[PDB]
Amino acid sequence: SKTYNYVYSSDPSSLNYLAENRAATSDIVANLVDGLLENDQYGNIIPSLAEDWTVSQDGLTYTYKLRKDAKWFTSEGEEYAPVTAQDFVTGLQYAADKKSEALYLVQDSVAGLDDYITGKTSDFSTVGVKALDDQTVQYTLVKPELYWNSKTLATILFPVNADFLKSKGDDFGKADPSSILYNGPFLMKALVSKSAIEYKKNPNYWDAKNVFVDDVKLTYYDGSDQESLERNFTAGAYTTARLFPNSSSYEGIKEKYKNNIIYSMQNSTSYFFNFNLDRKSYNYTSKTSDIEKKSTQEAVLNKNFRQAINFAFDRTSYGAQSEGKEGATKILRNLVVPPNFVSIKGKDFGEVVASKMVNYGKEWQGINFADGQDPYYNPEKAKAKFAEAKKELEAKGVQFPIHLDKTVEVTDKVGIQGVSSIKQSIESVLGSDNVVIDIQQLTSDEFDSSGYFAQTAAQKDYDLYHGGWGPDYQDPSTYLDIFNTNSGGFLQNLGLEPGEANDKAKAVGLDVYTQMLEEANKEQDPAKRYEKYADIQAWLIDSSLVLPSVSRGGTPSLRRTVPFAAAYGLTGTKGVESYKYLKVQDKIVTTDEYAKAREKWLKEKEESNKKAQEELAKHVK
Amino acid sequence: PIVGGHEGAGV
């Protein structure tokens, strides 16, 4: 048998793929539960549980034919029941009943669903998902969505068996392998907190022929032993290893692996800093008085202040802390929407956003949003913005310096160097009599409960947050909706709760942002629609409510995985997340071999995508 | 979905 061995860092809060919007859950369930469609190696959307599908000529009705040989299994591998179309009716109703955190993906798209979720109706037979027979699911939409099929790669549209769901009650989806059923490539054999995630190939999976590893073992990695990755790889214990050029170890490693260091491409997951606009929890702070806390509360609502932070934040120095001097810029991402995520009459989205920035102020003149460079850092612009902020804020009684708390895990040595760099650059440019970045080193429980796994905005315990978004479907709105005041998935990280915008949301203009989103969403012509979302992204950059930082990818590794064997997806959770298709080999891949494989994949991908787009028309009813 | 983990795009 063959085995993939590496590491993981995020324990899931649950396995509830219908209720969670955290990647800590979907990164796991991607390997355990299939939906209607999935990805091939080229980012095409291809059959999964659905062997075929059609869309009506008006674009409102999608019908899917489920393959007859797909079954549910228990975590121990026993057969439970065949997958049926009713499981998709059950899944959507459960997501609605449980108020899933990812409901924005469907609540405004599926006919009747918003009425059902909000209690206007009580009858799920009025909602636009139907099992026409055991093999046929039909969805009915409120308006056409060319990106609807890409949404089926997100877990809120995955199926669940109603008898299992009822049998399990509130035990369904807990962090225990027996809490869900399995119809995907793997069964979950071990899920041990701060220790291990282990998968075993399901030999009875409908597509077992495309699963080339029999075992996947992930060891918990808390960040305190970055050298262990290469150490275990060289000892034959890991299949891959991320390299850390800053380390004292790197000298000899690059000697030993001169011809094996491989750099990945930057991908569509985007990270950014944001501010806590309505902080309620001060368990982790270096502020000693209520006047300091109210001063920071006022500062983060001031646009000039946020812009000053933005221009003072040296992205190159930050990237260098994990990538080294040479590679510091390889991970930089300057928009939330990746610059080539869509195009508008051949022009990349990011070049359209760039063309719209000077309109928002002359401080943006010449800005370039391409990946892999820092267009923000500018000490003279930062100091000028801060001087205007300070006059506005001082008149409100605000006291300086403004203290900003940033958390980091105490074991996360590389992360600690990263946040140290942000402290150094901001304070160097603006002056530590004006701004102080207070780093709070937290235990795992402290770090989880104050940030990523906090369950309410009031529990967020920081002034500055560094999080990110992985796209759920193929449209700029997957990213840009996350700050909307009605239902934005990233509102709680800004200290705001979805619902009516409060005075702090209105102070920073997120109500206007939300109205812009609603108007852009009405556009169905892709070029016009994307241009409206480009305006929205430009507004957001100018607001400096996010400070774009880095992407995933762009990092050095050693590898015994086969290049470009795994699925790839621009959006959704059935590409790199899945260990289906992935292959392992005996030879450590060389840089030259990887580059030859990459150029081959890049060329095949364009050809493959063009044929996939031609195939689309055959599916129109 | 929401992505977290360590600091930035950390392991």
Side-chain angles (χ1 to χ4, degrees):
Chain A
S1 63
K2 285 285 218 134
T3 301
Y4 177 90
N5 303 282
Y6 197 36
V7 300
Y8 82 102
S9 85
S10 298
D11 286 313
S13 54
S14 82
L15 300 172
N16 198 327
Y17 57 95
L18 294 171
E20 282 260 24
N21 71 346
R22 289 170 176 77
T25 293
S26 48
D27 283 352
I28 296 173
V29 171
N31 295 283
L32 316 173
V33 179
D34 276 359
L36 295 158
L37 304 174
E38 70 188 50
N39 287 132
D40 64 6
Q41 291 89 349
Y42 302 115
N44 305 311
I45 299 173
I46 68 166
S48 204
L49 294 176
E51 60 184 30
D52 197 6
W53 66 274
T54 60
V55 58
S56 55
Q57 273 174 260
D58 63 13
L60 302 176
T61 300
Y62 286 81
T63 309
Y64 304 86
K65 196 212 202 163
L66 304 180
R67 64 188 68 251
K68 274 174 191 283
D69 68 317
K71 301 167 168 190
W72 294 109
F73 303 83
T74 73
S75 57
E76 286 303 313
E78 306 106 21
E79 174 169 309
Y80 189 92
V83 180
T84 70
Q86 188 69 32
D87 300 339
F88 286 90
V89 184
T90 303
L92 193 62
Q93 186 188 341
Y94 177 84
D97 292 344
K98 294 304 191 243
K99 309 289 169 263
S100 159
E101 295 161 340
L103 271 175
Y104 40 74
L105 298 177
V106 291
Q107 174 163 356
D108 303 304
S109 307
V110 173
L113 186 50
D114 181 62
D115 285 347
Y116 177 87
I117 290 163
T118 66
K120 318 295 185 189
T121 55
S122 65
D123 181 0
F124 202 73
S125 63
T126 62
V127 174
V129 62
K130 295 285 183 298
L132 306 183
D133 56 31
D134 283 4
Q135 307 306 313
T136 308
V137 201
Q138 192 170 76
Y139 293 81
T140 300
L141 305 187
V142 164
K143 66 162 195 190
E145 298 190 351
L146 286 170
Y147 41 87
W148 169 262
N149 273 344
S150 71
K151 282 185 179 168
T152 71
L153 275 70
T155 66
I156 197 171
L157 280 163
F158 288 12
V160 77
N161 176 282
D163 300 323
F164 184 79
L165 191 58
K166 177 151 183 291
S167 297
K168 280 289 162 200
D170 275 17
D171 275 3
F172 171 79
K174 293 182 181 223
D176 184 312
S178 76
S179 77
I180 60 171
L181 294 174
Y182 295 72
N183 64 1
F186 297 90
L187 305 161
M188 184 141 59
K189 282 342 180 155
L191 182 69
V192 184
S193 185
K194 311 284 174 281
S195 182
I197 298 176
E198 290 179 26
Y199 307 108
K200 181 75 197 39
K201 169 177 175 170
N202 188 343
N204 300 119
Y205 172 54
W206 69 268
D207 213 17
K209 61 175 167 65
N210 277 323
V211 184
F212 304 90
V213 287
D214 299 298
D215 289 273
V216 175
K217 315 221 312 213
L218 306 178
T219 295
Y220 179 62
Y221 173 88
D222 70 1
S224 66
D225 194 5
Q226 60 197 262
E227 296 82 6
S228 66
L229 304 187
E230 181 274 338
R231 185 188 320 122
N232 279 294
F233 174 87
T234 304
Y238 289 170
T239 313
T240 191
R242 199 261 218 244
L243 299 182
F244 295 97
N246 263 4
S247 274
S248 73
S249 202
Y250 194 69
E251 262 213 11
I253 291 178
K254 186 153 91 92
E255 201 46 58
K256 178 175 204 159
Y257 292 107
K258 47 198 101 60
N259 304 313
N260 302 113
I261 303 198
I262 292 160
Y263 280 90
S264 52
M265 292 168 286
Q266 300 184 253
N267 84 347
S268 62
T269 296
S270 294
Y271 294 84
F272 51 87
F273 287 79
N274 71 262
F275 301 90
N276 188 338
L277 304 175
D278 196 7
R279 187 166 177 187
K280 310 294 189 188
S281 187
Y282 290 90
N283 284 318
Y284 317 117
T285 188
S286 297
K287 290 179 270 291
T288 60
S289 65
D290 282 348
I291 178 62
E292 290 174 343
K293 294 169 179 172
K294 303 304 240 173
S295 293
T296 298
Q297 287 173 5
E298 290 286 353
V300 301
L301 304 174
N302 180 282
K303 188 180 172 180
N304 283 323
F305 175 85
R306 296 192 307 269
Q307 290 176 324
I309 302 299
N310 205 353
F311 296 134
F313 167 26
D314 181 351
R315 271 76 159 178
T316 304
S317 166
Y318 175 78
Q321 304 309 309
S322 58
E323 313 312 317
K325 264 272 261 163
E326 322 86 79
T329 63
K330 294 189 160 72
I331 65 175
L332 296 192
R333 160 71 38 79
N334 295 299
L335 293 173
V336 186
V337 183
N340 68 341
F341 188 74
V342 301
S343 80
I344 305 169
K345 296 143 171 214
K347 192 167 176 178
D348 284 338
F349 188 80
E351 300 288 337
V352 179
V353 181
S355 84
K356 293 166 174 299
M357 287 306 297
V358 173
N359 205 29
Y360 287 95
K362 283 293 175 243
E363 59 264 33
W364 300 114
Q365 174 64 50
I367 189 136
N368 171 13
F369 287 125
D371 280 353
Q373 50 88 32
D374 179 352
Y376 289 103
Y377 184 64
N378 188 309
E380 195 34 68
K381 291 188 192 176
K383 294 172 194 275
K385 287 294 184 171
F386 196 87
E388 271 287 281
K390 192 171 188 175
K391 175 72 224 93
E392 297 170 335
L393 291 168
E394 276 183 332
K396 303 190 161 173
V398 177
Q399 302 216 137
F400 291 85
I402 303 305
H403 289 259
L404 298 168
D405 291 307
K406 172 76 179 77
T407 65
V408 65
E409 255 173 305
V410 61
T411 56
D412 179 13
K413 295 315 186 313
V414 176
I416 289 166
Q417 293 307 308
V419 295
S420 296
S421 154
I422 297 179
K423 174 177 177 65
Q424 183 184 330
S425 61
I426 290 174
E427 291 181 15
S428 290
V429 162
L430 300 177
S432 70
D433 56 337
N434 285 311
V435 176
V436 173
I437 308 295
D438 292 312
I439 297 161
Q440 312 299 331
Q441 295 193 8
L442 303 183
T443 69
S444 168
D445 286 5
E446 288 172 341
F447 182 77
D448 290 347
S449 58
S450 60
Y452 186 77
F453 291 104
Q455 293 195 300
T456 76
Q459 292 171 357
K460 305 286 177 169
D461 204 314
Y462 54 79
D463 303 305
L464 272 173
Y465 189 66
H466 195 187
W469 191 257
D472 293 320
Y473 61 93
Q474 189 159 3
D475 188 79
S477 68
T478 187
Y479 300 94
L480 297 166
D481 282 358
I482 70 186
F483 312 104
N484 98 74
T485 56
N486 294 318
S487 70
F490 225 89
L491 275 177
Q492 286 184 342
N493 291 329
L494 277 70
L496 304 176
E497 293 287 3
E500 182 185 339
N502 71 357
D503 286 340
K504 285 146 205 303
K506 299 193 251 190
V508 307
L510 279 168
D511 56 333
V512 169
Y513 180 81
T514 296
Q515 285 154 357
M516 291 173 69
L517 285 167
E518 290 179 1
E519 297 303 305
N521 196 28
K522 299 161 161 174
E523 184 56 55
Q524 276 183 54
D525 169 61
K528 294 192 260 194
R529 177 185 178 87
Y530 295 159
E531 180 160 356
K532 287 187 180 126
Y533 281 103
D535 292 315
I536 292 167
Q537 172 72 98
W539 185 104
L540 187 61
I541 300 301
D542 173 65
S543 81
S544 284
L545 291 165
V546 304
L547 318 174
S549 52
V550 298
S551 72
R552 298 200 69 87
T555 53
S557 60
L558 306 170
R559 300 193 190 183
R560 282 184 285 250
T561 44
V562 175
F564 303 90
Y568 164 80
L570 183 65
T571 66
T573 195
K574 290 286 168 172
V576 66
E577 302 88 349
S578 166
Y579 293 97
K580 190 180 181 179
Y581 299 112
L582 177 147
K583 300 165 181 69
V584 179
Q585 55 174 54
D586 171 74
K587 184 183 186 189
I588 303 183
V589 180
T590 74
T591 305
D592 186 73
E593 289 172 338
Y594 192 80
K596 280 173 168 109
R598 184 193 62 241
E599 298 310 312
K600 173 166 141 186
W601 183 78
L602 286 173
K603 173 181 174 179
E604 289 167 352
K605 180 182 181 304
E606 297 309 312
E607 292 305 320
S608 192
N609 293 172
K610 285 186 274 180
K611 315 264 73 195
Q613 172 81 21
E614 221 57 13
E615 195 246 4
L616 281 183
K618 175 182 121 273
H619 296 266
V620 176
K621 196 159 50 191
Chain B
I2 304 183
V3 299
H6 291 326
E7 169 71 18
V11 184

